Design an enzyme around this catalytic site. Structure first.
Site, mmCIF file in Angstrom:
data_model
loop_
_atom_site.group_PDB
_atom_site.id
_atom_site.type_symbol
_atom_site.label_atom_id
_atom_site.label_comp_id
_atom_site.label_asym_id
_atom_site.label_seq_id
_atom_site.Cartn_x
_atom_site.Cartn_y
_atom_site.Cartn_z
ATOM 1 N N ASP A 10 0.811 -1.211 0.000
ATOM 2 C CA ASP A 10 0.000 0.000 0.000
ATOM 3 C C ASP A 10 0.866 1.293 0.000
ATOM 4 O O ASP A 10 0.592 2.224 0.751
ATOM 5 C CB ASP A 10 -0.950 -0.057 1.218
ATOM 6 C CG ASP A 10 -2.148 0.885 1.114
ATOM 7 O OD1 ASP A 10 -2.396 1.497 0.069
ATOM 8 O OD2 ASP A 10 -2.841 1.019 2.131
ATOM 9 N N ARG B 230 -0.914 9.013 1.191
ATOM 10 C CA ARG B 230 -1.646 8.981 2.473
ATOM 11 C C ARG B 230 -0.945 8.174 3.579
ATOM 12 O O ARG B 230 -1.271 8.320 4.759
ATOM 13 C CB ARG B 230 -3.059 8.405 2.274
ATOM 14 C CG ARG B 230 -3.068 6.931 1.886
ATOM 15 C CD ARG B 230 -4.451 6.303 1.758
ATOM 16 N NE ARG B 230 -4.336 4.983 1.116
ATOM 17 C CZ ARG B 230 -4.274 4.778 -0.203
ATOM 18 N NH1 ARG B 230 -4.342 5.796 -1.046
ATOM 19 N NH2 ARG B 230 -4.142 3.545 -0.696
ATOM 20 N N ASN B 231 -0.036 7.287 3.191
ATOM 21 C CA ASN B 231 0.656 6.392 4.114
ATOM 22 C C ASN B 231 2.082 6.840 4.420
ATOM 23 O O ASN B 231 2.823 6.129 5.096
ATOM 24 C CB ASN B 231 0.629 4.952 3.552
ATOM 25 C CG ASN B 231 -0.762 4.340 3.611
ATOM 26 O OD1 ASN B 231 -1.564 4.714 4.475
ATOM 27 N ND2 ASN B 231 -1.072 3.427 2.688
ATOM 28 N N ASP C 208 2.593 3.879 7.703
ATOM 29 C CA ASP C 208 1.498 2.943 7.911
ATOM 30 C C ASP C 208 1.827 1.610 7.236
ATOM 31 O O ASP C 208 2.291 1.591 6.088
ATOM 32 C CB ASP C 208 0.209 3.466 7.291
ATOM 33 C CG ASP C 208 -0.983 2.575 7.608
ATOM 34 O OD1 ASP C 208 -1.569 2.731 8.686
ATOM 35 O OD2 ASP C 208 -1.339 1.709 6.781
HETATM 36 C C1 LIG Z 1 0.514 7.790 7.885
HETATM 37 C C2 LIG Z 1 -0.390 7.220 8.692
HETATM 38 C C3 LIG Z 1 -0.321 7.391 10.181
HETATM 39 N N1 LIG Z 1 0.283 6.211 10.778
HETATM 40 S S1 LIG Z 1 0.370 6.280 12.414
HETATM 41 O O1 LIG Z 1 -0.943 6.666 13.013
HETATM 42 O O2 LIG Z 1 0.821 4.932 12.898
HETATM 43 C C4 LIG Z 1 1.585 7.470 12.812
HETATM 44 C C5 LIG Z 1 2.877 7.051 13.090
HETATM 45 C C6 LIG Z 1 3.853 7.978 13.425
HETATM 46 C C7 LIG Z 1 3.553 9.324 13.470
HETATM 47 C C8 LIG Z 1 2.258 9.753 13.198
HETATM 48 C C9 LIG Z 1 1.975 11.250 13.235
HETATM 49 O O3 LIG Z 1 2.837 12.028 13.657
HETATM 50 N N2 LIG Z 1 0.800 11.605 12.702
HETATM 51 C C10 LIG Z 1 0.413 12.884 12.551
HETATM 52 N N3 LIG Z 1 1.113 13.957 12.920
HETATM 53 C C11 LIG Z 1 0.419 15.045 12.579
HETATM 54 C C12 LIG Z 1 0.669 16.407 12.724
HETATM 55 C C13 LIG Z 1 -0.273 17.334 12.255
HETATM 56 C C14 LIG Z 1 -0.024 18.847 12.428
HETATM 57 N N4 LIG Z 1 -0.175 19.601 11.171
HETATM 58 C C15 LIG Z 1 -0.070 21.032 11.550
HETATM 59 C C16 LIG Z 1 0.007 21.969 10.328
HETATM 60 C C17 LIG Z 1 1.139 21.565 9.373
HETATM 61 C C18 LIG Z 1 0.967 20.100 8.980
HETATM 62 C C19 LIG Z 1 0.893 19.195 10.231
HETATM 63 C C20 LIG Z 1 -1.446 16.893 11.656
HETATM 64 C C21 LIG Z 1 -1.698 15.539 11.508
HETATM 65 C C22 LIG Z 1 -0.757 14.621 11.979
HETATM 66 N N5 LIG Z 1 -0.719 13.296 11.980
HETATM 67 C C23 LIG Z 1 -1.808 12.499 11.405
HETATM 68 C C24 LIG Z 1 -1.382 11.652 10.200
HETATM 69 C C25 LIG Z 1 -2.666 11.164 9.522
HETATM 70 C C26 LIG Z 1 -3.624 10.434 10.483
HETATM 71 C C27 LIG Z 1 -3.140 8.991 10.686
HETATM 72 O O4 LIG Z 1 -3.992 8.302 11.620
HETATM 73 C C28 LIG Z 1 -3.790 11.122 11.842
HETATM 74 C C29 LIG Z 1 -2.476 11.629 12.435
HETATM 75 C C30 LIG Z 1 1.264 8.828 12.855
#
Ligand SMILES: C=CCNS(=O)(=O)c1cccc(C(=O)Nc2nc3cc(CN4CCCCC4)ccc3n2[C@H]2CC[C@@H](CO)CC2)c1
Length: 295
Positions: A148, A152-153, A169
């Site tokens: 995958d 998105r991952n 992911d």
């Molecule tokens: C890619 C899929 C996610 N896999 S995971 O849930 O196992 C994982 C593993 C390691 C790290 C993370 C993570 O850090 N996720 C995450 N960090 C985010 C930070 C932001 C803040 N934004 C502010 C403005 C500038 C851009 C960033 C936003 C979303 C963040 N996420 C997401 C990733 C997508 C989903 C995944 O469940 C929720 C968490 C997520």
């Protein structure tokens, strides 16, 4: 206690690094996948982490899926694959503790950081591509099939300059290790995968081609205006996507090699990295302006 084997070494729950629940504090929600909600947390200059949670209301199979996810991520050791700090599986709700990726997911990043009325340049996109190709080469070297590879991952360390992209992911590989139609990543899959259910490292080459398209399109959905079945028939009949807007020729040609019909004719990731590196050093590629989205 299901066992998990990667790179010829077997592991079980006992190998996971359990972090006492009292060392772990949640700060804020970061969003959700299909897999519960993800938080920013800190582990006790505390360590900043992402905390993936398992719903307390879940099946015995969800429990096993979550364990398997933990074992899978914990056995990787590479700079372009998110690190696992540890787990907290002995209190409820159960946690997996991961490298915090402050830049969020790549698809969202690309869509939100599109140049509008200097944010991104070709070289930024090529660096993202190199980073993910480096993670994919590491998987290939270790005989792990991801299944995958998609924007998105992937995740980013930070929004700004110096960002590093990493694979974040492994849910599809986890499902298959433990083994619906409408949930398959059809638009990222090669013919032999969706026809015969045959997966190899040349499967991930194909998907990487589609990721490259996503990156250079600045986060558009692949095969614009096509549904899954339409894409399936289009690809199976030799159809390929057009170049993204302003895509340099040499970068497009990486995509078309990734999408060769026969797996044998697709490049391995060592070759893909060589071609990305050549694009990166080529002035006519990196001096190409990205389109400006009107706003
Ligand atoms: C890619 C899929 C996610 N896999 S995971 O849930 O196992 C994982 C593993 C390691 C790290 C993370 C993570 O850090 N996720 C995450 N960090 C985010 C930070 C932001 C803040 N934004 C502010 C403005 C500038 C851009 C960033 C936003 C979303 C963040 N996420 C997401 C990733 C997508 C989903 C995944 O469940 C929720 C968490 C997520």
């Amino acid at each position: 206690n299901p066992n998990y084997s990667f790179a010829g070494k077997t592991s079980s729950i006992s190998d996971l690094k359990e972090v006492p629940r009292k060392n772990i504090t949640l700060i804020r929600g970061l969003g959700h996948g299909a897999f519960g909600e993800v938080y920013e947390g800190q582990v006790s200059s505390p360590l900043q982490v992402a905390v993936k949670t398992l719903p307390e209301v879940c099946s015995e199979q969800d429990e096993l899926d979550f364990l398997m996810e933990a074992l899978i991520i914990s056995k990787f050791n590479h700079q372009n694959i998110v690190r696992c700090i540890g787990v907290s599986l002995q209190s409820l709700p159960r946690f997996i503790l991961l490298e915090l990726m402050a830049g969020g997911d790549l698809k969202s990043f690309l869509r939100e950081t599109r140049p509008r009325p200097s944010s991104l340049a070709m070289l930024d996109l090529l660096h993202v591509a190199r980073d993910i190709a480096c993670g994919c080469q590491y998987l290939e070297e270790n005989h792990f099939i991801h299944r995958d590879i998609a924007a998105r991952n992937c995740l980013l360390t930070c929004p700004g300059p110096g960002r590093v992209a990493k694979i974040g992911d492994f849910g599809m590989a986890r499902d298959i290790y433990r083994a619906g139609c409408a949930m398959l990543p059809v638009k990222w899959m090669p013919p032999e995968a969706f026809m015969e259910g045959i997966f190899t490292s040349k499967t991930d080459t194909w998907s990487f081609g589609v990721l490259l398209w996503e990156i250079f399109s600045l986060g558009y959905m692949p095969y614009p205006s096509k549904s899954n079945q339409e894409v399936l028939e289009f690809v199976t009949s030799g159809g390929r996507m057009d170049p993204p807007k302003n895509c340099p020729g040499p970068v497009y040609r990486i995509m078309t090699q990734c999408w060769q019909h026969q797996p044998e004719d697709r490049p391995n990731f060592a070759i893909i990295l060589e071609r990305i590196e050549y694009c990166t050093q080529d002035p006519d590629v990196i001096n190409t302006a990205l389109p400006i989205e009107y706003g």
